[PDB]
């Protein structure tokens, strides 16, 4: 459980991500794909991208950055009450996309790395801790549906 004060730190920094969703989504996905190349292989649509320059130039990648960050933003704003949201995501990612829970930890590290990089002043260690917690909660809840489904 996050405290109300923890949620405010989380949503304060996300309100800022929301100032440039597409720039954030880009940076986060490139970070993910470069740090953890196995992740890129799960996207048929992105497997042709070899270089960082190619990734940065991809409009479709940028579009997908917006897609994931938008879903995440909607989840965070439920402040833990995200049951309706997690259901379809867990179902598709376990069964259709075949995404290990571990990869959700990877995208969380990438999110933190970039948020750190773009809002030093609203992402001190306190806000970083709060964001860690929110992302962990999400992972925990997803993992529970994975185990239910036999992943």
Cβ neighbours around 114 below 10 Å, total: 22
* Structural domain span for residue 87: 1-151
Write the CATH number for 27. 1.10.490.10
Sequence-separated contacts (24+) of 139-142 with Cβ below 8 Å: 139/101, 139/104, 139/105, 139/108, 141/82, 141/86, 142/86, 142/89, 142/90, 142/93, 142/101, 142/104
CA–CA dist 82, 23 (Å, integer): 25
CA–CA dist 104, 111 (Å, integer): 10
CA–CA dist 101, 109 (Å, integer): 13
Cα dist. 27→86, 118, 123 in Å?
Answer: 24, 10, 17
**Cited resolution, angstroms:** 1.9
Cα dist. 36→102, 105, 141 in Å?
Answer: 11, 11, 23
Cα dist. 89→9, 27, 28, 47 in Å?
Answer: 25, 22, 19, 22
What Rg value do the Cα atoms of the chain yield, rounded? 15
**What sign does the CA torsion over 61, 62, 67, 68 have?**
positive
Residue 49 has which token pair? 């991208």
Residue 54 has which token pair? 């190619």
Per-residue H/E/C for the chain? CCCHHHHHHHHHHHHHHCCCHHHHHHHHHHHHHHHCHHHHCCCCCCCCCCCHHHHHHCHHHHHHHHHHHHHHHHHHHCCCCCHHHHHHHHHHHHHCCCCCHHHHHHHHHHHHHHHHHHCHHHCCHHHHHHHHHHHHHHHHHHHHHHHHCCC
Q: Choose among 70, 96, 85: nearest CA to 138.
A: 85
**Tokens 């970070």, residue?**
31
Please tell me whether 12 is known to bind a ligand.
no
Domain count, the chain: 1
Please tell me whether 93 is known to bind a ligand.
yes
């Amino acid at each position: 459980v996050l405290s109300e004060g923890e949620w405010q730190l989380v949503l304060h920094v996300w309100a800022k991500v929301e100032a440039d969703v597409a720039g954030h989504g880009q940076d986060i996905l490139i970070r993910l794909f470069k740090s953890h190349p196995e992740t890129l292989e799960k996207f048929d649509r992105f497997k042709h991208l070899k270089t960082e320059a190619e990734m940065k130039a991809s409009e479709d990648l940028k579009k997908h950055g917006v897609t994931v960050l938008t879903a995440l933003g909607a989840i965070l704003k439920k402040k833990g009450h995200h049951e309706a949201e997690l259901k379809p995501l867990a179902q598709s990612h376990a069964t259709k996309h075949k995404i290990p829970i571990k990869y959700l930890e990877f995208i969380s590290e990438a999110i933190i790395h970039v948020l750190h990089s773009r809002h030093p002043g609203n992402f001190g260690a306190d806000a970083q801790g709060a964001m860690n917690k929110a992302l962990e909660l999400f992972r925990k809840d997803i993992a529970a549906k994975y185990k239910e489904l036999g992943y």
